[PDB]
Write a protein that binds this DNA or RNA. Structure first.
Lengths: 990, 416, 218
DNA sequence: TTCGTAATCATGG
DNA sequence: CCATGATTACGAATTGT
């Protein structure tokens, strides 16, 4: 009776229980039902003085309660912390009960259930049949979870079941609504417990005039008329709306394990449910494992932006990849095709050319290990392939090799040998295809829909959602379904509760929390010399450990409003509070009248936050080692999930220390952490800048003095290295923040830079730094143009790479998807960035010669475009969403669309996405001063031909373009002079 | 919401808005916090010159009826309302007054909720009553209550008017003789029964006269008020140093002056001159002497003395040497808590009567040297702050502040 | 005061001037909802669907809202019961009598009082199926509520669960209080003190109080 | 919760 | 007086057709 857990979910009826869904070795599904109680923590005297005795009480032993409230002090006579040591009791109430002096009230009931019962949310257990009572088929009841889960066993592999689905609706002019637009296609990917994978697609028949249905049936598709006569092994099935929706409702009702959809909670599921309701009163029903609760599907909202969730209670997890990707890691755009571009990419070699086609070959000897396999696996259902991140091509034939792939695309010939392949945008307009509906169009949309449905699966294995879910549930002590639904303040209560019980301590705030009230600027932007990147090894957790910065180890906070008291206090502080036992951290005063604020922390006994951080760091290091010494794929995935979970939970401490409604609120600790981090960053930045490498020695710009107090280490600036004698390099420091530091080396030989970076890292770690502060060499950047860490472009070489290596084109901050900028502006930005990157590698660039050259090029291009008028109108067309939900009085855009509606037979509704541009009489010459622009915007339709009496405002687009270009570049006076000469305005920098 | 605590808090806000007073910092902070709470919980909320009508300056016929007449005196005016501290017009700062009168005023106010606030008149450490403001009870009944506690009460006259009467200057003189008060009469406020609007009468007249010089006279413990003398020797009362500086008085020059039937007062300069207050302050200081520094509303000494200051504030006997000083300090048992609950810097500041803001600003701009937890040497770091002559005077007196600070630290270590 | 025409029933809607500047949007959202509503009989008749547009929004200060109209014998005016038989109106009348101290009473009409508007969030419902038209009316309800919110001072909600996240539904922040379930078990609605806080804020909004007794029927 | 453009208003060189 | 500077308001950066 060995079971592995999958999910834990609660019942929200009149009688509430808790559910365990588990699988055995064979593959059977077992549901176990527990009663859920309300957990309270009281003191022994409080327990002995309750008139109605609690339902059940369990001792916890002697706990020490500490008041962690902070009081200022304008002197050095500080009152000691008050601690109360007493026996403590834990009680369970079937119904909610209020206790006046209950403690530890910021922890969830489910976490108490787990920790008291000694059950991990996802372990493998040999259950006991004595305490389980059968009530239905597959649903049992348990009353004593403590003894039933006594035995623990090593994990064992189990199968799983998945559903992925996609929808394609009809639309002509606007975003579809349920009342006017039916479903054209639905696609399903299905994985059962037998391990067999099925794919199928349902096509509507109301757009398939009888002859087309007959020709499709003769072609090879299937036609059905009732619900009972559908078989899944048939790939394509033709049916009406009613039966299609009935099959959708039937499929959504099974007891799956994961129903995964990209943005399906807002559009797909809602669309199906509402359309089914309109067509027929029949509605989807979910039932509890005990067959006692029946609920209907109604998507609800949570404001975290708004994230939609399903009200299922049958144990299935309705997962939405969109929200997970949004809250997991940061991208430029969160479109499906953009994520596919960033995820599935490879490099291939051209084997054939000629006519309008090309043959690409891909193997592991070209890009890396596993990239070719992933690209080939996605290629099974792919339709369009993106090449060189510039062109989109239609696949004509594809052949999966034994350990690679080959593909033939319809692309123009290109003068190269190795190119980059990716999956991305599709050059198809669905509105036109829906206008002329024929069987070929229907089949091709069927292929698109099935590829879209499978892409969710491919992303699901790419991101490792299953292993990460299990790891997070185990570490956080939380049910699976809610691992990716809560913020940082909730995923920290489990480990914090465990640490509090292990240390036998309680922290209380017996007051109220009044609500008390940096951007780094790089020295230069265009670099043209190599940049070494270094990453700090978890600066905040390590420095919190170093300073013992915890709420319960704060000796006091001493403030002074005058130099008299400040000097006296500093003298008495150095007299009575000596190092290294204590530490004193200056901070910015919390009130305008204060001039000095000092917080004192004790290092005699380790705190609670440092203990949690040390535990997290040690576990992550152990899991890194275990992953590095592993060979199987499953073990590697599990270890990667564990290390990622520990990293993501250990990096949320600093934020929670500054949150009022958190369980780790500490103002003094937060300010101390920030100040000490700033001090360490400044010390490293000062010691690196100007340090040179002469002969076989390296000299730093300043003495290696500890910035906190006296240390027994040697402080000789000159350090002996083992690099070649002839090397003579001088380094500079440009940028530095919490998680990285940038260093500047004046050369272009990547191999020498890499070796010197490795040696410098070793020397800094062994000699310059101290205690548990260390750094790691990350990458080498070339052609660096940067405003901040939000926006920059460069070429990236990894640490373990040589001169003959493929660069990584890093570019972020720019969206390239903002559909209200231009079509001409984007192309100009791309060409000018390419020219900048081309001239930034020449060798003789300095600072004040790139700006003049780019300015002259911009002169030539802008004047040529203005005097030529050869650009088509479609490149200068902008678009905007129409909606009359506007405040104020007029907002002339409403006036413009109303006038167009009045003066043209074509009518624009309140959801139509309309095009507009700038047109003027052609007789006006170049204008420098600018006036209002809203009255020069005109709406362009399909039939609009630009008359000879009108032209387009080149000046507006040129001003926007030159503003964006001037946002780059170093010199200021030249740029402002150019801008004043051209458009007669002041540039808006930053 | 279900409990009535929220609606009780809401009517508390409504009452506070009905009696809004921006001068009280604590009340304003509490009101702002409550407004923030209301606009955060409910996502939104809807949230004494006006008490006086136009002053009468010419004779006019009066409406027959029952009226109450009360002289308005010449001096600084204070207002004290329930739930807030005392308020002085213009800036709204605070001041320290004995707790006995605090309790008496609280007992007066809490008896009747209709009394909005009480009016205080201060002139050269002399506190008297002028008028009362209540929407339900006439002040006549509460003069008896105020006199019962021993607190001084003014002269009020209740007169019933039957026929039309002209408020000519002769009537004003007859009324003033009827009052027969030694204190100066700056105006007369008279009220009609049953009317919430209370109104005042002040006849005005102006001319030009020559002042010989401006002197200053001793009033008490480091409190001084400027005194102006003329050719004829008549004394002109001055409101404060602020009135002197804002009236733009000039030495050995003819100035325009306000007159009443019994006394004459200087008045504000309403011209469009370009004179700057900064140079006027130093000119007045030079005319009156460099041994003076302004504590806001008054002037103070710069005398060295040194040791004859702690005895006065401590309300103890005279001291000669250190050992007997320590013995006499120890022998007292009641004042000890003031020593044991208050710092040293502010204690020295009170002992030498230094201003709060001025000294606090000064001590943050010039460096010290501390040895054996004692002050030994000091030196100025930035000399710009010396531009104000008061800064220079305080810097000159700082040589005695350091010594008294050392002595206070010595005795503090000796006691504990 | 003008009229507009609909392709489907009522085929004619008469509206007041204050409701003019957004009413046009309504018809655009109505021709895509009208066809489906008429399939099943609804209470009341479609002819009384938009009679609440008559009360001008200039002379109103407080708003009372209901999630659904009366399932049976609907008349159009929200919270109206001439026979005084509905549980909700009975509870409202009893609470008003208790608050005002009036012992003898016969009926109450909320439309008589000047300053308050009787409003329903869903303007139609099927008999025997409470709240069976949320999807049909959603957009129209949001539009009308956002318009009425720009004229009323304080908004008093009915139903804790129905309007739980009403703050997110309205973009403009406006003084709002949520009321309890009118027929809540354990006499929860008896202890409610919404009428006092309503006029406390109304006075705080520099507005005259509201004479509830005006709505009484004798 | 972000930023960037456009129209308006307001202040010291 | 007005170029210069600083506020205020707008609206997609949205995602699913």
């Amino acid at each position: 009776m060995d079971v592995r857990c999958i999910n834990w979910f609660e019942s929200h009826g009149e009688n509430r229980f808790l559910y365990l869904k588990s699988r055995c070795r064979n593959g059977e599904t077992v549901f176990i039902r527990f009663p859920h109680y309300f957990y309270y923590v009281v003191t022994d005297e409080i327990y002995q003085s309750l008139s109605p005795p609690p339902f059940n009480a369990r001792p916890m032993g002697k706990m020490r309660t500490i008041d962690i409230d902070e009081t200022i002090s304008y002197n050095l006579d500080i009152k000691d912390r008050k601690c109360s040591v007493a026996d403590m009791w834990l009680i369970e109430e079937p119904k909610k009960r209020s206790i006046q002096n209950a403690t530890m009230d910021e922890f969830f009931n489910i976490s108490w259930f787990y920790i008291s019962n000694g059950i991990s949310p996802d372990g493998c257990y040999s259950l006991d049949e004595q305490y389980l009572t059968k009530i239905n088929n597959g649903c049992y009841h348990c009353d004593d979870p403590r003894n039933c889960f006594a035995k623990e066993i090593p994990r064992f592999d189990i199968p799983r079941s998945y559903l992925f689905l996609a929808i394609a609706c009809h639309f002509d002019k606007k975003f579809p609504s349920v009342f006017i637009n039916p479903i054209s296609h639905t696609s399903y990917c299905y994985i059962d417990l037998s391990g067999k994978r099925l794919l199928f697609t349902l096509i509507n028949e109301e757009m398939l005039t009888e002859q087309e249905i007959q020709e499709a049936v003769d072609r090879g598709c299937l036609r059905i008329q009732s619900l009972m006569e559908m078989d899944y092994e048939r790939e394509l099935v033709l049916c009406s709306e009613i039966v299609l929706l009935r099959i959708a409702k039937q499929l959504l009702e099974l007891t799956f394990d994961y129903v995964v959809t990209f943005n399906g909670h807002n559009f797909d599921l809602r669309y199906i449910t509402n359309r089914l309701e309109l067509l027929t009163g029949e509605k989807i029903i979910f039932r509890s494992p005990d067959k006692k609760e029946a609920v209907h599907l109604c998507i609800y909202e949570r404001n975290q932006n708004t994230t939609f969730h399903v009200n299922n209670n049958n144990g299935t997890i309705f997962f939405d990849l969109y929200s997970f990707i949004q809250k997991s890691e940061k991208l430029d755009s969160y479109k499906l095709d953009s994520i596919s571009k960033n995820a599935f990419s490879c490099m291939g070699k051209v084997l054939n050319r000629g006519v309008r086609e090309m043959t690409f070959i891909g193997d592991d000897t070209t890009d890396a290990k596993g990239k070719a396999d992933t690209f080939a696996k996605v290629l099974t259902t792919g339709n369009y392939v993106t090449v060189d991140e510039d062109i989109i091509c239609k696949v004509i034939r594809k052949d999966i090799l034994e350990n690679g792939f080959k593909v033939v695309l319809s692309c123009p010939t290109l003068p190269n040998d190795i190119y980059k392949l990716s999956f991305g945008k599709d050059d198809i307009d669905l509105a036109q295809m829906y206008k002329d509906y024929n069987l070929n169009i229907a089949l091709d949309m069927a292929r698109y829909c099935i590829h879209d449905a499978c892409l969710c699966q491919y992303l699901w294995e790419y991101y490792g959602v299953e292993t990460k879910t299990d790891a997070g549930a185990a570490t956080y002590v939380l049910p699976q379904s809610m691992v990716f639904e809560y913020r940082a303040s909730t995923i920290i209560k489990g480990p914090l509760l465990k640490l509090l019980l292990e240390t036998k301590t309680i922290l209380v705030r017996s007051e109220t929390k009044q609500k008390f009230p940096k951007v780094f600027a790089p020295k230069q932007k265009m670099f043209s010399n190599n940049v070494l990147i270094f990453d700090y090894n978890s600066l905040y957790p390590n420095v919190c450990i170093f300073g013992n910065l915890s709420p319960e180890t704060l000796v006091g906070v001493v403030v002074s409003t005058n130099r008299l008291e400040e000097e006296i206090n500093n003298q008495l502080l150095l007299q009575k509070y000596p190092p290294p036992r204590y530490i004193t951290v200056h901070c910015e005063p919390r009130l305008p009248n204060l001039i000095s604020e000092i917080a004192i922390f004790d290092r005699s006994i380790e705190g609670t936050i440092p203990r949690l951080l040390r535990t997290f760091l040690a576990e992550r290091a152990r899991y890194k080692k275990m992953l590095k010494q592993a060979t199987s794929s499953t073990e590697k995935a599990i270890y990667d999930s564990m290390q990622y979970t520990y990293k993501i939970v250990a990096n949320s401490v600093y934020g929670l220390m500054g949150f009022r409604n958190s369980a780790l609120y500490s103002y003094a600790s937060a300010k101390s952490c920030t100040s000490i981090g700033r001090r360490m960053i400044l010390y490293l930045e000062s010691v690196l800048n100007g340090a040179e490498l002469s002969n076989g020695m390296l000299r730093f710009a300043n003495t290696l003095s500890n910035p906190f107090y006296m240390d027994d280490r040697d402080i000789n600036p000159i350090v002996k290295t083992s690099l070649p004698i002839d090397y003579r390099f001088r380094f500079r420091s440009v940028y530095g923040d919490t998680d990285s530091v940038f260093t500047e080396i004046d050369s272009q030989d990547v191999d020498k830079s890499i070796e010197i970076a490795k040696e410098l890292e070793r020397l800094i770690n062994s000699r310059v730094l101290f205690n548990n502060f260390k750094i790691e060499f990350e990458a080498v950047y070339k052609n660096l143009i940067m405003q901040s860490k939000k926006k920059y472009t460069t070429m990236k070489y990894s640490a373990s790479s040589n001169s003959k290596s493929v660069p990584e084109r890093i570019n972020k901050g720019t969206s390239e998807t903002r559909r209200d900028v231009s079509k001409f502006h984007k192309n100009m930005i791309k060409t000018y960035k390419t020219r900048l990157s081309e001239m930034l590698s020449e060798g003789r660039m300095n600072s004040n010669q790139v700006c003049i050259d780019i300015l002259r090029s911009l002169e030539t291009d802008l004047r040529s475009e203005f005097d030529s008028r050869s650009s088509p109108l479609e490149l200068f067309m902008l678009s905007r969403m129409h909606h009359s939900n506007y405040k104020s009085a007029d907002n002339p855009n409403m006036y413009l669309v109303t006038e167009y509606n009045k003066n043209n037979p074509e009518t624009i509704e309140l959801g139509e996405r309309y095009y507009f541009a700038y047109i003027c009489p052609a007789n006006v010459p170049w204008t420098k001063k600018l006036v209002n622009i809203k009255t020069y915007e005109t709406i362009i339709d399909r039939s609009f031909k630009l008359g000879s009496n009108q032209r387009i405002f080149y000046e507006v687009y040129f001003k926007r373009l030159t503003s964006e270009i001037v946002n780059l570049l170093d010199n200021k006076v030249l740029c402002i002079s150019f801008f004043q000469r051209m458009f007669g305005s002041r540039p808006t920098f930053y | 919401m279900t409990s009535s605590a929220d609606l009780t808090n809401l009517k508390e806000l409504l009452s506070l808005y009905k009696s809004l007073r921006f001068s009280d910092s604590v009340a304003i902070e509490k009101y702002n916090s409550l407004v923030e709470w209301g606009t955060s919980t409910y996502w939104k909320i809807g949230v004494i010159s006006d008490y006086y009508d136009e002053v009468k300056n010419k004779p006019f016929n009066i409406d027959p009826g029952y009226y109450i007449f009360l002289p308005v005196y010449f001096g600084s005016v204070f207002i004290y309302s329930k739930g807030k501290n005392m308020v002085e017009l213009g800036s709204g700062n605070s001041f320290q007054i004995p707790d006995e009168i605090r309790s008496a005023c609280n007992k007066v106010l809490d008896s009747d909720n209709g009394i909005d606030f009480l009016r205080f008149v201060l002139l050269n450490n002399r506190w008297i009553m002028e008028d009362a403001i209540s929407k339900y009870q006439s002040p006549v009944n509460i003069f008896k209550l105020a006199s019962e506690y021993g607190l001084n009460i003014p002269n009020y006259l209740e007169i019933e008017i039957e026929e039309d009467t002209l408020f000519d200057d002769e009537l004003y003189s007859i009324m003033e003789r009827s009052f027969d008060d030694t204190f100066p009469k700056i105006s007369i406020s008279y009220i009609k029964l049953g009317e919430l609007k209370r109104q005042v009468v002040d006849f005005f007249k102006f001319s030009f006269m020559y002042i010989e010089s401006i002197k200053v006279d001793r009033i008490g413990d480091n409190i001084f008020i400027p005194s102006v003398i003329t050719k004829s020797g008549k004394k002109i009362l001055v409101k404060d140093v602020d009135h002197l500086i804002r009236s733009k008085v000039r030495e050995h020059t003819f100035v325009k002056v306000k007159k009443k039937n019994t006394f004459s007062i200087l008045y504000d300069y309403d011209g469009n001159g370009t004179e700057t207050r900064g140079e006027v302050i130093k000119r007045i200081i030079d005319t009156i002497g460099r041994d003076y520094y302004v504590n806001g509303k008054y002037f103070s000494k710069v005398g060295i003395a040194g040791l004859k200051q702690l005895t006065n504030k401590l309300d103890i006997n005279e001291c000669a040497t250190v050992d007997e000083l320590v013995d006499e300090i120890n022998k007292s048992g009641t004042v000890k808590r003031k020593i044991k609950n208050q710092s040293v810097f502010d204690l020295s500041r009170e002992c030498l009567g230094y201003p709060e803001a001025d000294f606090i600003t000064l001590v943050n701009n010039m460096r010290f040297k501390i040895e054996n937890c004692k002050v030994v040497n000091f030196n100025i770091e930035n000399t710009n702050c010396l531009n104000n002559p008061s800064i220079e005077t305080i810097y000159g007196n700082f040589n005695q502040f350091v010594s008294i600070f050392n002595t206070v630290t010595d005795v503090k270590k000796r006691l504990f | 005061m003008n009229s507009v025409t609909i392709s489907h029933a009522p085929y004619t809607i008469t509206y007041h001037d204050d409701w003019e500047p957004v009413m046009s949007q309504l018809v655009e959202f109505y021709n895509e909802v009208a066809s489906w509503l008429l399939r099943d009989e609804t209470s009341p008749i479609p002819d009384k669907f938009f009679i609440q547009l008559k009360q001008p929004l200039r002379n109103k200060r407080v708003c009372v809202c209901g999630i659904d109209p009366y399932p049976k014998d609907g008349t159009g005016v929200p919270f109206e019961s001439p026979n005084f038989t509905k549980k909700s109106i009975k509870e409202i009348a009893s609470s008003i009598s208790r608050l005002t101290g009036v012992i003898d009473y016969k009926g109450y009409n909320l439309n008589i009082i000047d300053g308050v508007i009787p409003w329903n969030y869903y303007l139609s419902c099927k008999l025997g199926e409470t709240k069976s038209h949320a999807i049909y009316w959603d957009k129209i309800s949001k539009l009308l509520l956002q318009h009425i919110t720009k004229h009323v001072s304080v908004l008093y909600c009915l139903g804790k669960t129905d309007f739980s996240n009403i703050r997110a539904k309205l973009e403009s922040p406006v003084t709002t209080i949520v009321g309890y379930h009118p027929a809540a078990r354990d006499h929860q609605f008896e202890k409610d003190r919404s009428f006092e806080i309503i006029n406390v804020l109304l006075e705080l909004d520099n507005k005259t109080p509201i004479n509830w007794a005006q709505g009484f029927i004798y």
